Design an enzyme around this catalytic site. Sequence first.
Site, PDB file in Angstrom:
ATOM      1  N   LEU A  18      -6.439   2.244   3.698  1.00 20.23           N
ATOM      2  CA  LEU A  18      -5.214   1.881   4.408  1.00 20.23           C
ATOM      3  C   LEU A  18      -4.051   1.696   3.440  1.00 20.23           C
ATOM      4  O   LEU A  18      -2.914   2.021   3.766  1.00 20.23           O
ATOM      5  CB  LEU A  18      -5.404   0.629   5.273  1.00 20.23           C
ATOM      6  CG  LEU A  18      -6.338   0.839   6.477  1.00 20.23           C
ATOM      7  CD1 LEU A  18      -6.526  -0.427   7.289  1.00 20.23           C
ATOM      8  CD2 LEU A  18      -5.807   1.966   7.346  1.00 20.23           C
ATOM      9  N   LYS A  20      -3.018   0.147  -0.990  1.00 24.43           N
ATOM     10  CA  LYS A  20      -3.466  -0.473  -2.226  1.00 24.43           C
ATOM     11  C   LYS A  20      -2.317  -1.035  -3.018  1.00 24.43           C
ATOM     12  O   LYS A  20      -1.148  -0.813  -2.698  1.00 24.43           O
ATOM     13  CB  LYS A  20      -4.240   0.517  -3.093  1.00 24.43           C
ATOM     14  CG  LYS A  20      -3.412   1.590  -3.743  1.00 24.43           C
ATOM     15  CD  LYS A  20      -4.257   2.830  -3.990  1.00 24.43           C
ATOM     16  CE  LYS A  20      -4.409   3.654  -2.716  1.00 24.43           C
ATOM     17  NZ  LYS A  20      -5.279   4.831  -2.935  1.00 24.43           N
ATOM     18  N   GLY A  21      -2.671  -1.763  -4.066  1.00 19.05           N
ATOM     19  CA  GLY A  21      -1.694  -2.369  -4.940  1.00 19.05           C
ATOM     20  C   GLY A  21      -2.464  -3.078  -6.023  1.00 19.05           C
ATOM     21  O   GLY A  21      -3.677  -2.855  -6.167  1.00 19.05           O
ATOM     22  N   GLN A  22      -1.777  -3.939  -6.769  1.00 16.24           N
ATOM     23  CA  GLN A  22      -2.380  -4.587  -7.927  1.00 16.24           C
ATOM     24  C   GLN A  22      -3.452  -5.613  -7.542  1.00 16.24           C
ATOM     25  O   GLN A  22      -4.366  -5.877  -8.319  1.00 16.24           O
ATOM     26  CB  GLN A  22      -1.300  -5.221  -8.810  1.00 16.24           C
ATOM     27  CG  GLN A  22      -1.727  -5.412 -10.258  1.00 16.24           C
ATOM     28  CD  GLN A  22      -2.153  -4.110 -10.929  1.00 16.24           C
ATOM     29  OE1 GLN A  22      -3.133  -4.075 -11.679  1.00 16.24           O
ATOM     30  NE2 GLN A  22      -1.413  -3.037 -10.667  1.00 16.24           N
ATOM     31  N   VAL A  26      -7.267  -1.656   0.137  1.00 16.95           N
ATOM     32  CA  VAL A  26      -7.639  -2.015   1.505  1.00 16.95           C
ATOM     33  C   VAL A  26      -8.098  -0.802   2.292  1.00 16.95           C
ATOM     34  O   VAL A  26      -7.375   0.194   2.372  1.00 16.95           O
ATOM     35  CB  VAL A  26      -6.480  -2.706   2.273  1.00 16.95           C
ATOM     36  CG1 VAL A  26      -6.941  -3.107   3.663  1.00 16.95           C
ATOM     37  CG2 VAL A  26      -5.972  -3.912   1.514  1.00 16.95           C
ATOM     38  N   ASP A 134       3.530 -16.180  -3.620  1.00 16.12           N
ATOM     39  CA  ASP A 134       4.048 -14.836  -3.875  1.00 16.12           C
ATOM     40  C   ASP A 134       4.526 -14.252  -2.545  1.00 16.12           C
ATOM     41  O   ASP A 134       4.282 -13.097  -2.222  1.00 16.12           O
ATOM     42  CB  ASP A 134       2.938 -13.973  -4.505  1.00 16.12           C
ATOM     43  CG  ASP A 134       3.451 -12.655  -5.060  1.00 16.12           C
ATOM     44  OD1 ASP A 134       4.443 -12.655  -5.814  1.00 16.12           O
ATOM     45  OD2 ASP A 134       2.854 -11.610  -4.734  1.00 16.12           O
TER      46      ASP A 134
END
Lengths: 323, 313
Positions: A18, A20-22, A26, A134
């Site tokens: 679905l 992504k990132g750091q 997902v 955050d």
Amino acid sequence: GPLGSMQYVGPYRLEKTLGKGQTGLVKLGIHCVTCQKVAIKIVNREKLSESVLMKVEREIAILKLIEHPHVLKLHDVYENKKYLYLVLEHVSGGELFDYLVKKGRLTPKEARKFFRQIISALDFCHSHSICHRDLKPENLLLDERNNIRIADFGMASLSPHYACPEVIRGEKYDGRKADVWSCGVILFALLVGALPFDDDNLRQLLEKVKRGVFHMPHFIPPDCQSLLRGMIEVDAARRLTLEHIQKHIWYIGGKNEPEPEQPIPRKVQIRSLPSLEDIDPDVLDSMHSLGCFRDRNKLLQDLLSEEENQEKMIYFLLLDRKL
Amino acid sequence: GPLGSMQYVGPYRLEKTLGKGQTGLVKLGIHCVTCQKVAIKIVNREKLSESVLMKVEREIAILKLIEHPHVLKLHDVYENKKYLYLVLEHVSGGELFDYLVKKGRLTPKEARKFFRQIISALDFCHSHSICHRDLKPENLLLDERNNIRIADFGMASLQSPHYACPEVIRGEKYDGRKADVWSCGVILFALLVGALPFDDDNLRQLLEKVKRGVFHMPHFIPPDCQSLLRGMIEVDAARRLTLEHIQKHIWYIGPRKVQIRSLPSLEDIDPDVLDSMHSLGCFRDRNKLLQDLLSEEENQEKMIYFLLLDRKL
């Protein structure tokens, strides 16, 4: 998904990625019996400090145990030696600014509906010793009825436009106060359609934020303006608390407007533990088994200390769960 | 979407955010008449340096004029001074490695099917002076048939060392065609093995592995395929296989290209085509433009010229 990541997590079969990132990748998960949709967040556990992992496993245990209508529900967690898998509520309405962009700017009445959802979720999580730290627009997901779920509580351990000066300076900060700043910025954007601090150049943007001077348009009502100035306040000690916010007339004036608000989930009652005697043997045993609490004595010390902490919170959640 | 971004792009209404990263934000778009879905990539022009913006707009100009069944189709480009909007083919089948995870590893026959799609797309793009330069699994999208569309050509300057050739890792001058070949070797290996040829829990050590370029080749990989992989994952860019060589390889064997021509003199330059080039925007220095059209070298300036000439034809 990442190489060597299972096709199934518990009863969920992993389908397409679905996003992504750091903080991880997902994927959409499908229950193999019931075919329900979940989002599964995959975290690489090898690239984390042991102290980080400990903190994470703690926040996770809390989040698994609690539920709020505007917090993305963590249903379960699965672990192998390398990857951690978080089973999350699946939502697909997009993100809050998609809605903002379509409207240009929101009326004070609509902005406040969203603000009450966000503040309510933050209040709840803060009450369980969990800060976001955050908070930014992409964490504010929308369901199909256009209601917020705040994602990524507890992921910080693993952007500058929404961060308070103390976070930007990498100083040691109060997490609750950082969330208040971030919410102020978001409330601003809802009402204005632009950010209070923005620059083409990064270095300049950081200084704007640290300086904390911004212009509020006339069309923001004066009641709301006083709220914004108290939240977007550089002096963390002077910055409004969530308690201040929820007592503020502009906030209060939004109860059930324009629409009735989601049910308020029960918060767990946390008490003192006067002595070893007053600790429940079965709850202590189940906590002791977890991994981040393998040292029974350090566990006993953290439970009996005067300080408010996540150890105590987990204990009382589990205690509450038994009854 | 991003604040200040448009609500409508041409005939497309912007809906939900699909994903985002360093190279921009992708939103779902809906044609207001046909209800056709597109993917709209929003890119902030202001955050970009001068040379980056130009490099990106030049390649986008080539991409919007060509089409291949395994390259994510760029349909059009819109701009407010703040944002570029790239109207793209909409695909939602996931990414290649989602498929790989389900299978564990592919048979040499199935892997070859994907490989031929990828190489076909790169050979097409390279023919038009476009290298990917940043090829990674998440660029390899799947449509509903589990066929590949390679996405994000032209975005490399807006920026995964597992997939980068040693010259790219070293930050040196390099042939983009050669980098793509290395990345394709690494990907092919991953499809066959279900693991990367170079991997490490620590970034510093991984870069070293890639630079040294030694890897373990499993015995179950057929030897003519194994020779292919060695030719592609070859540290010496001069020695590394060309796409031409790959397409003649025994293992490999088992869309209209426009050709760049020379422009000897200013009198050879079609005034309509030049005007259209002037209007693009990535050509600010117009003297530099003309030099590049009259130069002795293949370049994207000539490519754009001849794509425009052919399109007028």
